[PDB]
From Swiss-Prot, chain A:
Source lineage: Eukaryota, Metazoa, Chordata, Craniata, Vertebrata
Organism: Homo sapiens
Quaternary structure (record): Component of a phosphatidylinositol 4-kinase (PI4K) complex, composed of PI4KA, EFR3 (EFR3A or EFR3B), TTC7 (TTC7A or TTC7B) and HYCC (HYCC1 or HYCC2). Interacts with PI4KA, interaction is direct. Interacts with EFR3 (EFR3A or EFR3B), interaction is direct. Interacts with HYCC (HYCC1 or HYCC2), interaction is direct. Association with the PI4K complex is strongly reduced by TMEM150A.
UniProt name for this protein: Tetratricopeptide repeat protein 7B
Full-length numbering of the shown residues: 213 to 422 of 843
TPR repeat start and end residues: 7-40, 118-151, 152-177
Localisation: Cytoplasm, Cytosol; Cell membrane
Coiled-coil segments: none
Gene name per UniProt: TTC7B
Biological role: Component of a complex required to localize phosphatidylinositol 4-kinase (PI4K) to the plasma membrane. The complex acts as a regulator of phosphatidylinositol 4-phosphate (PtdIns(4)P) synthesis. In the complex, plays a central role in bridging PI4KA to EFR3B and HYCC1, via direct interactions.
Swiss-Prot record, chain B:
Implicated disorder: Neurodevelopmental disorder with spasticity, hypomyelinating leukodystrophy, and brain abnormalities: A severe autosomal recessive disorder characterized by global developmental delay with impaired intellectual development and poor or absent speech, axial hypotonia, and peripheral spasticity and hyperreflexia. Brain imaging shows hypomyelination with decreased white matter volume, cerebral and cerebellar atrophy, and thin corpus callosum. Polymicrogyria may be observed in rare cases.
Residue segments, region G-loop: 336-342
Positions spanned in the full protein: 1477 to 2083 of 2102
Designated name of the protein: Phosphatidylinositol 4-kinase alpha
Originating organism: Homo sapiens
Residue intervals of the PIK helical domain: 54-242
Length: 177, 575
C-alpha cells in the first residue's frame, strides 16, 4: 500500500550522488526516474525531482555540456527546451491542487501552495525573460492572476510584463492598483 | 470614388432615420398618456413616420445582424446602447455579446456593459478565461450581490469583484442594505463574505450593532423558538460570539449601556404580562413606567439618526388583540456622524412607538424597502406622489419595535363623501379642493403599488386617514401568495367628480400611467432583492413568484402598448 523506507532507499542514492559531486550519474538517474510512467502514487515524487532537475540544469552548467536523454555524452535539443517542457507539465497538473484563498480558519496549506506557485512562476519568468519572449510570459502571468488577492509581488510582475510587451492602458490600470 | 461614398452615406442615412423615428414615437407617447384625439399634432409627417416604422419592423433576422456590425464600426458605445432602444429580436443581444467577448477592453462604462460579459454562460459553468474584471468600475450594490445568489455558480473573480464594489460605499448605504448581507452567508463557499463582515464591523460601530441585532434575531426559526436552523445556525452563533468582546474601551461602554437599557425597557412588558385586561393592567404598566430609569446617551434603534431626551411617564397603554404596549418619547434629531461623536465621547420632537411580542416583522421590512425605492425613483424623475416609510425593526424572535405616525386617525375607527363635505365645506372652497388633490395623490400611488405587489385580502381596517387628507395602508403581512385586482367602490368615485368623465378622473388616469411608465425599468433590482430573500422559507415564497413578477412588468413591449395595457387593466378593475 504505502511503505516508509522504500522511498528512503530510492532517494538516498541520489542524495549521496549530489552530495559527493557525482553530478553526471545523479542527473542520469534523475532522468531515468523521470522516464518511468506516472501512476496515481508518484505525482509528488515527480514534482520534486522535476523541480530539482530544472533548478540544477538552469544554474549548473552551460549549453555545450548537455545531450539528449536517450543518448549519453518528443526529443528536446537544448536544455531550456526540456526545462520549459518540465515547467509546463508541472504547472499544468499542479493547477488542480489549489486552495483558492478561502482562509476560513486555516492558512498554512494556503501558504505552502502560494510558495509553490511563486517559485514555479519565478522559474518560468527567469527562463523566458533571457530569451526575449514576452507575449507568452504575459499570458502566463495573466492566467496565474487567479490566486492573488492582496499580494504585491504578482501585481508588480504582471504590470512590468504588460508594460514591457507593448500594451499600455492595462499596464496603467494595474500600476494604479 | 463614387459608389463607395454613395453606399457609405446611404447606410448611415437609413440608420439615422430609424433611430429618429423611434425617438419621436417614444416622445409623443410620453406627451399624452391617453389617445386624446382633441390634443393632436401635425398630421402630414406622422403618416410617413408610421409607414417607415412598419417598413423597418417588417425585416428579417438577416440584414439585421449587420446593423450591429455597422454600429460597432461607427462607435462601440452606440452599439452597447442599441438594445436599450427596444427592437423585438434576440439576435441583437447575441451579436453584442459576441462582439464584446471578442475584445472587452474597448468598453468600460460601468452600469450596463458588464452584463454582456459577466455571463460567459448562465448555468453551464465552464470556460474560465478572458475574465479580467479587475479593470471595471463599481456598480450599484444590488447588482453586485447577485453574484452570491442562487443564480450564478460560485467563482473567485466574481467574488473579488463583488467585495471590491461593496468596499466602496459610505456606511449609510450598507446600513440600508444590511438584511441581505447576512442572508448572503448561506452561499459563502469561500471566506470573502465573513471577512468583509468582520472588517466592516471593526470599521464602524452602528453597523456592528445592527449586525448583532440581526444575527441575534435570525439565529432561530420560530418566534418562540424550539428548532434552530440546521444550515447556518452554528457559524452564525460562532460569528455572534466572535464579533463582541474584540471591541473594547468607549465602544464597549456604549455597547453595555445601550444593551442594558434595551433589556431593561424590554422586560417591562413581560413583567406586566400576568395582569389581565382592564384598568389594573394600565395601573401596573404606569407604575412600571415610573419605575423605568433612563441613562443618558442611549438612542432608539428604529431611528438611529436621533438621540432620546425623555419620556411621558403617564402614557403607557396596551392595545387590544401577548402584551404589546405603546410609549411616547421626546427626542431630538442631530444626524449620523454627530451621533457617532456623541456616542464615542460619552430640533426636538415627540414620537410614538409600539412594542410587539409574538409575531414576525420581516415581510414588512421587505415591503418598506420596496416602497422607499419607489419613492426615491418618483422623487428623482420629478413627479408628485406620496408614500410614508414608517420604520420597523425586529430585535428578537417575535419581538419588534414599530414607529408610529403622530396624530393618527384611522378611517375605520373614526359616508366618506358626507364627512369630506361637512369637514371641508362646499365644493367651491379651497380646503375641499386641496383635500381632493391630496386624496388623488395618495390613491394613485397606493393603487399602483398594490397592483405591482399583488397584496390581497384587504379590508377597511388597514386604511389610516391623516388630517391633511392623505391615505396610508398598513398590515402588508399577507403578500405575494395569499388572500378585483384594484379596490374601487362608489364613494370615492362619487367624490372625485361624480363620473369617469370628470377632470379629476382624467388626472388620476394620467398620473397612474406616468407612474407605471417611470417605474418600469428597475425590474432587475426588484428581482435581485426578491430572489435574495426567496430562500428564507416565509409562508409567502412558494417558488413560482419570480416568473409572475417578471411577467407583470411587461418587459418585451413598447411604450404605447404598455400604456394601453395599463389603461385596460385599470378600466377592467372597476367592478
Amino acid at each position: 500500500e504505502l511503505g516508509f523506507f522504500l522511498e528512503t532507499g530510492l532517494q538516498r542514492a541520489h542524495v549521496l550522488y549530489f552530495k559527493n559531486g557525482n553530478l553526471t550519474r545523479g542527473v542520469g538517474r534523475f532522468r531515468e526516474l523521470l522516464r518511468a510512467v506516472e501512476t496515481r502514487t508518484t505525482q509528488n515524487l515527480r514534482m520534486t525531482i522535476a523541480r530539482q532537475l530544472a533548478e540544477i540544469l538552469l544554474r549548473g552548467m552551460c549549453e555545450q555540456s548537455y545531450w539528449n536523454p536517450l543518448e549519453d555524452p518528443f526529443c528536446p535539443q537544448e536544455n531550456t527546451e526540456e526545462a520549459l517542457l518540465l515547467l509546463l507539465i508541472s504547472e499544468s497538473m499542479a493547477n488542480r491542487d489549489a486552495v483558492l484563498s478561502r482562509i476560513p480558519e486555516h492558512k498554512s496549506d494556503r501558504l505552502i501552495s502560494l510558495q509553490s506557485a511563486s517559485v514555479v512562476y519565478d522559474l518560468l519568468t527567469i527562463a523566458l525573460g533571457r530569451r526575449g519572449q514576452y507575449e507568452m510570459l504575459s499570458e502566463c502571468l495573466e492566467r496565474a492572476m487567479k490566486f492573488a488577492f492582496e499580494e504585491f509581488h504578482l501585481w508588480y510582475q504582471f504590470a512590468l510584463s504588460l508594460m514591457a510587451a507593448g500594451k499600455s492602458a492595462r499596464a496603467v490600470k494595474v500600476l494604479k492598483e | 470614388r463614387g459608389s463607395q461614398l454613395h453606399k457609405y452615406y446611404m447606410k448611415r442615412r437609413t440608420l439615422l432615420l430609424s433611430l429618429l423615428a423611434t425617438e419621436i414615437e417614444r416622445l409623443i407617447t410620453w406627451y399624452n398618456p391617453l389617445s386624446a384625439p382633441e390634443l393632436e399634432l401635425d398630421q402630414a409627417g406622422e403618416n410617413s413616420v408610421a409607414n417607415w416604422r412598419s417598413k423597418y419592423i417588417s425585416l428579417s433576422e438577416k440584414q439585421w445582424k449587420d446593423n450591429v456590425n455597422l454600429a460597432w464600426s461607427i462607435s462601440p458605445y452606440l452599439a452597447v446602447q442599441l438594445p436599450a432602444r427596444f427592437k423585438n429580436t434576440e439576435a441583437i443581444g447575441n451579436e453584442v455579446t459576441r462582439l464584446v467577448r471578442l475584445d472587452p477592453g474597448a468598453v468600460s462604462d460601468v452600469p450596463e456593459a458588464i452584463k454582456f460579459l459577466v455571463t460567459w454562460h448562465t448555468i453551464d459553468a465552464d470556460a474560465p478565461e478572458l475574465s479580467h474584471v479587475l479593470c471595471w468600475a463599481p456598480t450599484d450594490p444590488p447588482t453586485g450581490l447577485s453574484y452570491f445568489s442562487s443564480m450564478y455558480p460560485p467563482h473567485p473573480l466574481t467574488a473579488q469583484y463583488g467585495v471590491k464594489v461593496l468596499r466602496s460605499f459610505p456606511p449609510d448605504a450598507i446600513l440600508f442594505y444590511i438584511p441581505q448581507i447576512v442572508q448572503a452567508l448561506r452561499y459563502d463557499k469561500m471566506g470573502y463574505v465573513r471577512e468583509y463582515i468582520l472588517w466592516a464591523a471593526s470599521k464602524s460601530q452602528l453597523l456592528a450593532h445592527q449586525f448583532i441585532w440581526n444575527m441575534k434575531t435570525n439565529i432561530y426559526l420560530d418566534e418562540e423558538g424550539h428548532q434552530k436552523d440546521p444550515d447556518i445556525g452554528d457559524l452564525l452563533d460562532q460569528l455572534v460570539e466572535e464579533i463582541t468582546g474584540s471591541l473594547s474601551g468607549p465602544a464597549k461602554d456604549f455597547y453595555q449601556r445601550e444593551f442594558d437599557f434595551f433589556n431593561k425597557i424590554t422586560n417591562v412588558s413581560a413583567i406586566i404580562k400576568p395582569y389581565p385586561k382592564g384598568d389594573e393592567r394600565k395601573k401596573a404598566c404606569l407604575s412600571a413606567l415610573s419605575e423605568v430609569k433612563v441613562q443618558p446617551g442611549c438612542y432608539l434603534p428604529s431611528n438611529p439618526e436621533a438621540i432620546v431626551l425623555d419620556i411621558d411617564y403617564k402614557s403607557g397603554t396596551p392595545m387590544q388583540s401577548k402584551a404589546p404596549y405603546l410609549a411616547k418619547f421626546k427626542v431630538k434629531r442631530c444626524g449620523v456622524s454627530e451621533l457617532e461623536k456623541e456616542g464615542l465621547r460619552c430640533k426636538i420632537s415627540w414620537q410614538a412607538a409600539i412594542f410587539k411580542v409574538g409575531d414576525d416583522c420581516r415581510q414588512d421590512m421587505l415591503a418598506l424597502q420596496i416602497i422607499d425605492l419607489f419613492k426615491n425613483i418618483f422623487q428623482l424623475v420629478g413627479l408628485d406622489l406620496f408614500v410614508f416609510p414608517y420604520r420597523v425593526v425586529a430585535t428578537a424572535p417575535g419581538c419588534g419595535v414599530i414607529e408610529c405616525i403622530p396624530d393618527c386617525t384611522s378611517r375605520d375607527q373614526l359616508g366618506m363623501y358626507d364627512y369630506f363635505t361637512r369637514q371641508y365645506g362646499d365644493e367651491s372652497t379651497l380646503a375641499f379642493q386641496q383635500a381632493r388633490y391630496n386624496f388623488i395623490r395618495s390613491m394613485a400611488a397606493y393603487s399602483l403599488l398594490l397592483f405591482l405587489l399583488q397584496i390581497k385580502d384587504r379590508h377597511n381596517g388597514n386604511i389610516m386617514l391623516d388630517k391633511k387628507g392623505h391615505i396610508i395602508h398598513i398590515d402588508f403581512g399577507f403578500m405575494f401568495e395569499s388572500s378585483p385586482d384594484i379596490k374601487l367602490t362608489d364613494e370615492m368615485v362619487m367624490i372625485m367628480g361624480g363620473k369617469m368623465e370628470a377632470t379629476p378622473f382624467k388626472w388620476f388616469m394620467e398620473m397612474c400611467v406616468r407612474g407605471y411608465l417611470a417605474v418600469r425599468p428597475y425590474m432587475d433590482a426588484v428581482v435581485s432583492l426578491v430572489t435574495l430573500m426567496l430562500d428564507t422559507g416565509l409562508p409567502c415564497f412558494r417558488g413560482q413568484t419570480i416568473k409572475l413578477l417578471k411577467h407583470r412588468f411587461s418587459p418585451n413591449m413598447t411604450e404605447r402598448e404598455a400604456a394601453n395595457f395599463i389603461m385596460k387593466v385599470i378600466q377592467s378593475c372597476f367592478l
